[PDB]
């Protein structure tokens, strides 16, 4: 399976614009990931990381994005917050693994890397694995509005990038390796 292609990718999207890579019809080697020091966080929900090699799935979805370290914790079931509610939500259910690493020497810059954005205003929260990449000036009561007039605010903001690259493996023809 094309795991390295996702984790060691040279470019990641914003959280609000998280990208979904589908893994299927392949052998999922989780040993490289499991005991590597690449990741600062290796969190699985109801799934034993050690046993990932022994689990078969219809498919695996690797959701890729860059989020400030502080908000990495929002990428989990049962969470609230600007990211959990407006940028990228995980369902209240079992989950595969949320894998993340520090990217201060990759994505962060001395003046702040503001190429990455996030949502903070929206007419309601996001559903689990919903992607909202629209950019229409926010209006608190559904009215038409034009910025920078009063009550007219852009729903998106910029990240003051320390950033972490996060890849979420959501589990639904893919299995781990066999040993000869």
């Amino acid at each position, epitope marked *: 399976c094309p795991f390295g292609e996702v984790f060691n990718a040279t470019k990641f999207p914003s959280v609000y614009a998280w990208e979904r890579k589908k893994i299927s019809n392949c052998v999922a080697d989780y040993s490289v990931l499991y005991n590597s020091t690449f990741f600062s966080t290796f969190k699985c929900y109801g799934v034993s990381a050690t046993k990932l090699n022994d689990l078969c799935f219809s498919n695996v979805y690797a959701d890729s994005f860059v989020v400030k370290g502080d908000d990495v914790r929002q990428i989990a079931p049962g969470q*609230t*917050g600007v990211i959990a509610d407006y940028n990228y939500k995980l369902p209240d259910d079992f989950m595969g693994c949320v894998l993340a690493w520090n990217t201060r020497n990759i994505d962060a810059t001395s003046t702040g890397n503001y190429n990455y954005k996030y949502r*903070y*205003l929206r007419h309601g*929260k996001l559903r689990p694995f919903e992607r909202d990449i629209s950019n229409v000036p*926010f209006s*608190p*009561d559904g009215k038409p509005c034009t910025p920078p007039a*009063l*009550n007219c605010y852009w729903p998106l903001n910029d990240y003051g990038f320390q950033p972490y690259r996060v890849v979420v493996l959501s589990f639904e023809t893919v299995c781990g390796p066999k040993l000869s």
Partner: antibody
Amino acid sequence: AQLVESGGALVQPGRSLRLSCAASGFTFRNYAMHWVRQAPATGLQWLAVITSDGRNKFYADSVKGRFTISREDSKNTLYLQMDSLRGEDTAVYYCVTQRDNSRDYFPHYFHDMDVWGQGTTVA
Amino acid sequence: VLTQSPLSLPVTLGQPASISCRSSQSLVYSDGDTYLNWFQQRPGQSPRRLIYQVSNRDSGVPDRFSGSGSGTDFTLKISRVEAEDVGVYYCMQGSHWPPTFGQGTKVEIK
């Protein structure tokens, strides 16, 4: 969480008045701040909110463009700048915030409004 | 827009009372919750919250205060009204911006 209003006065229509509200018992910087006024005409009427970072300012249509909400975190003080005052603006102005900032983002800072000051009269 | 009833509640000391609040629109928010709170303003004092999220009470609030409701129709209930309960009971909605209050119900002790 204690809020203390001041700056109330009698001001002729067309003129301006600026209110202030000192905060104590909590960290001012960590909460959004609101102004609400009281009068027989409206009962309790929400006017404006300024977010914790002082960036987003939302106003009721009834004051939108006439009132400006601002804050000085360094003084733990909330302000309200009211221009072109009318007779209809006669009310007791209350300084309002929240104790629970678990969800410090729009619109969740309108959900509790559980911290009120003593209120100051503006006429 | 919130409307309360009665405008004034004449309750004999030690007897129960209830204050109604009716919204022009459902107060259920986008997350499924309902942000309908109740406040009491005692003469000479500012408003204080008693009940929140329709039926929950704040710490320090007497157990005699409770409530119920859904959609547009909400009620604040007082199992027994004491002399110290004199004041104007307001309902407030934060579900739809701008947040609004009812006109308030003046509860007095007879």
